[PDB]
Amino acid sequence: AMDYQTIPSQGLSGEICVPGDKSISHRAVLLAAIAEGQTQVDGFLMGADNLAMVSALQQMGASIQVIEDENILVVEGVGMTGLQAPPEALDCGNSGTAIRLLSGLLAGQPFNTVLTGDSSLQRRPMKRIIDPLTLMGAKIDSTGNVPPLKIYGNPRLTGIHYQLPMASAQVKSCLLLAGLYARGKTCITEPAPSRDHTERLLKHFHYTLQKDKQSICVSGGGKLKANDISIPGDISSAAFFIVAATITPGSAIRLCRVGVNPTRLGVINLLKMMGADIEVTHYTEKNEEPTADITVRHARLKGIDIPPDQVPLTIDEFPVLLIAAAVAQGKTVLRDAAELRVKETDRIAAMVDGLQKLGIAAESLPDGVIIQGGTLEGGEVNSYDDHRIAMAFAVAGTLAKGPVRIRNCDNVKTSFPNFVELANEVGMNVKGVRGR
Ligand SMILES: O=C(O)C1=C[C@@H](OP(=O)(O)O)[C@@H](O)[C@H](O)C1
Ligand SMILES: O=C(O)C[NH2+]CP(=O)(O)O
């Protein structure tokens, strides 16, 4: 039982390299596992969520050498049909991405699999993948449309045309993966574009994608071919520092080699709309993902009305963006973000609770929040076991008038194992301490 304790910052400074992208890491190892040939993955995120994906794949006979101290995986692919029936349930930990992408991969295998997870994951919604996989011919049992899931593999799935009913890159990805195993074309239409890492990695692994009028499509029966991958820094991890440097007087930092995929840039798009001073330089493209260095200096902010097209491009950054909104001049309004309620925790409820506890006038909406910019006070908040709520309030502590105690931070290692170390290195004071 560990908590974080902060004291205000006198200014962030320095150059830091954040760890690898969680979303790209999940996809890289999964596709590499079923490719033909050897894939070396550099920059792999050695956090709990990504290592749960690795262990699950190893239980099914993927050949993965984990070099944790170097953030490298060496994967010897087993080909499309090379996986083997696992002996026990696959424990996905806290990871919705893992359970949802694995379900797509496993729906068309000739064996049965049970997928489970931690107490948070077992409360999260799965009807969104069960419905369309079932249309493809899958058989997935669940009690109450939440995990645990039992997948009765069907090696004769059929492609479908599906329009996403919510802006979910996970549903899109799940269906594209099942599409690799399905007879014919699987075409996905996205009315609200979400992160496109699956599409980019499929191309990297030489799997062809086609696009028509309104959708992206894959045809089953192709072969993934091994191709070394360098994973960019996670912009979601960098976002904590981007906000901290933006709001803390005297700050100027540079974040090196961060992924800057346009479908992941919402936090920068929105902060610039608020008045932030953010420069993206040294742009490079590798393995179909763009990377760049991001330089951030303190700037005074104004409240904004957040547009809906940016919600799927900023979904995981709302916790830390709301901290920026809390110290901006004026009102910030977030609507059409009901997806926040079905994450590791209900992130709207969690952010509103913590902000009120730190003296901010924050109000919940069914699909968002309304925040009146003000002044953060010291106090005590609860992470609700959500890594991003925890890190968001650690960022709040940079500008809070007094110390901030953040309860229950043991899940920060699901996405950012060295958060505390890097935070202290740049000037945002954080101590890991024993809780109650
Ligand atoms: O596909 C992915 O890697 C992710 C998609 C998002 O979830 P949804 O697909 O539920 O929006 C995001 O919240 C998650 O952390 C990573
Ligand atoms: O990383 C985050 O902020 C949200 N993760 C959602 P999950 O991968 O567990 O579905």
- Among the bound ligands, name the one nearest to the CA of residue 52: 2
45 and 135 together in one domain: yes
Give Cβ neighbours of residue 56 (< 8 Å, ≥ 6 apart).
86, 90, 91, 92, 98, 102
State if residue 261 touches ligand 1 by the CB under 6 angstroms criterion.
no
Q: What phi and psi values does residue 231 have, to the nearest 5 degrees?
A: -85, 125
26 and 77 together in one domain: yes
CATH number of the domain that 47 lies in? 3.65.10.10
Tell me how far apart the 2 most distant CA atoms of the chain are, in Å.
Answer: 61
Determine the Cα–Cα distance for residues 429 and 423; give it in Å rounded to an integer: 7
* Residue 30, number of CB atoms within 10 A of its CB: 27
285 and 202 together in one domain: no
Gyration radius from the chain CA atoms? 21
State if residue 120 touches ligand 2 by the CB under 6 angstroms criterion.
no
220 and 301 together in one domain: no
Question: Best mutation site among 195, 198, 342, 347 for ligand 1, i.e. most ligand atoms within 8 A of its Cβ?
Answer: 195
Determine the Cα–Cα distance for residues 120 and 197; give it in Å rounded to an integer: 25
* Residue 227, number of CB atoms within 10 A of its CB: 19
Residue located nearest, by CA, to atom 15 of ligand 1: 316
CB-side neighbour CA atoms (13 Å) of 131? 14
Q: Considering only CA atoms, which of 167, 181, 171 is closest in space to residue 221?
A: 181
**Whether residue 8 has a cis bond before it, omega within 30° of 0:** no
Secondary structure of the chain in HEC code, one letter for each residue: CEEEEECCCCCCEEEEECCECHHHHHHHHHHHHHCECEEEEECCCCCHHHHHHHHHHHHCCCEEEEEHHHCEEEEECCCCCCCCCCCCCEECCCCHHHHHHHHHHHHCCCCEEEEECCCCHHHCCCHHHHHHHHHCCCEEEEECCEEEEEEECCCCCECCEEECCCCCHHHHHHHHHHHCCCECEEEEECCCCCCCHHHHHHHHCCCCCEECCCCEEEECCCCCECCCEECCECHHHHHHHHHHHHHCCCCEEEEEEEECCHHHCHHHHHHHHHCCEEEEEEEEEECCEEEEEEEEECCCCECCEECHHHHHHHHHHHHHHHHHHHCCECEEEECCCHHHHHCCCCHHHHHHHHHHHCCCEEEEECCEEEEECCCCCCEEEECCCCHHHHHHHHHHHHHCCCCEEEECCHHHHHCCCCHHHHHHHHCCCEEEEECC
| Measured distance between the N- and C-terminal CA atoms of the chain, rounded to whole angstroms | 8
- Among the bound ligands, name the one nearest to the CA of residue 120: 2
280 and 201 together in one domain: no
242 and 180 together in one domain: no
Residue located nearest, by CA, to atom 2 of ligand 2: 316
Q: How far is the CA of 301 from the centre of ligand 2 (A)?
A: 27
Q: What phi and psi values does residue 95 have, to the nearest 5 degrees?
A: -90, 105
Q: How far is the CA of 97 from the centre of ligand 1 (A)?
A: 6
Q: Which of 231, 255, 284 is the endpoint of a domain?
A: 231
Does 168 count as an annotated binding residue? Answer: yes
217 and 342 together in one domain: no
Choose, from 3, 91, 316, 385, the residue flagged as catalytic: 316
Determine the Cα–Cα distance for residues 197 and 51; give it in Å rounded to an integer: 19
Give the nearest ligand 2 atom to 415 CA. 1
Give the nearest ligand 1 atom to 343 CA. 13
Does 169 count as an annotated binding residue? Answer: yes
236 and 143 together in one domain: no
Instruction: Dig out the tokens for 81 from the structure.
Output: 């049909």
Instruction: Dig out the tokens for 143 from the structure.
Output: 């009690």
246 and 150 together in one domain: no
Give Cβ neighbours of residue 2 (< 8 Å, ≥ 6 apart).
408, 409, 410, 432, 433, 434, 435
| Burial (0-12, 13-18, 19+ Cβ within 10 Å), 81 | exposed
Give the nearest ligand 2 atom to 387 CA. 3
The order of strands in the sheet holding 216-219 is 161-163, 185-189, 216-219, 210-211
Residue located nearest, by CA, to atom 10 of ligand 2: 96
Determine the Cα–Cα distance for residues 384 and 280; give it in Å rounded to an integer: 33
Give the nearest ligand 1 atom to 128 CA. 10
Q: Say if CB 291 and CB 232 are below 8 A apart.
A: yes
Q: Considering only CA atoms, which of 322, 279, 295 is closest in space to residue 13?
A: 295
Output the CA–CA distances (angstroms, integers) from residue 2 to 42, 48, 429, in the order listed.
30, 16, 16
Does 316 count as an annotated binding residue? Answer: yes
Q: In this structure, which amino acid lies at residue 219?
A: S
CB-side neighbour CA atoms (13 Å) of 420? 16
271 and 375 together in one domain: yes
State if residue 197 touches ligand 2 by the CB under 6 angstroms criterion.
no
50 and 194 together in one domain: yes
* Residue 417, number of CB atoms within 10 A of its CB: 17
Q: Which residues of 354-374 are buried (b: 16+ CB within 10 A; e: fewer)?
A: bbebbbbebebeebbbbbebb
* Residue 210, number of CB atoms within 10 A of its CB: 11
Output the CA–CA distances (angstroms, integers) from residue 138 to 175, 225, 425, in the order listed.
11, 26, 49
Does 343 count as an annotated binding residue? Answer: yes
Q: How far is the CA of 91 from the centre of ligand 1 (A)?
A: 18
Q: Say if CB 390 and CB 408 are below 8 A apart.
A: yes
Is 316 an active-site residue? Answer: yes
Q: How many domains does the chain have?
A: 2
338-344 contact pairs (CB < 8 A, 24+): 338/366, 338/367, 338/368, 339/166, 339/167, 339/168, 339/311, 339/315, 340/315, 340/368, 342/124, 342/125, 343/96, 343/124, 343/386, 344/94, 344/96, 344/120, 344/385, 344/386, 344/387, 344/388, 344/411
Give Cβ neighbours of residue 429 (< 8 Å, ≥ 6 apart).
6, 7, 8, 9, 397, 398, 423
126 and 194 together in one domain: yes
Determine the Cα–Cα distance for residues 50 and 244; give it in Å rounded to an integer: 26
Q: How far is the CA of 185 from the centre of ligand 1 (A)?
A: 24
What domain range includes position 45? 22-231
The order of strands in the sheet holding 277-286 is 13-17, 252-259, 289-297, 277-286
Q: Which of 231, 264, 282 is the endpoint of a domain?
A: 231
Q: Which of 231, 266, 290 is the endpoint of a domain?
A: 231
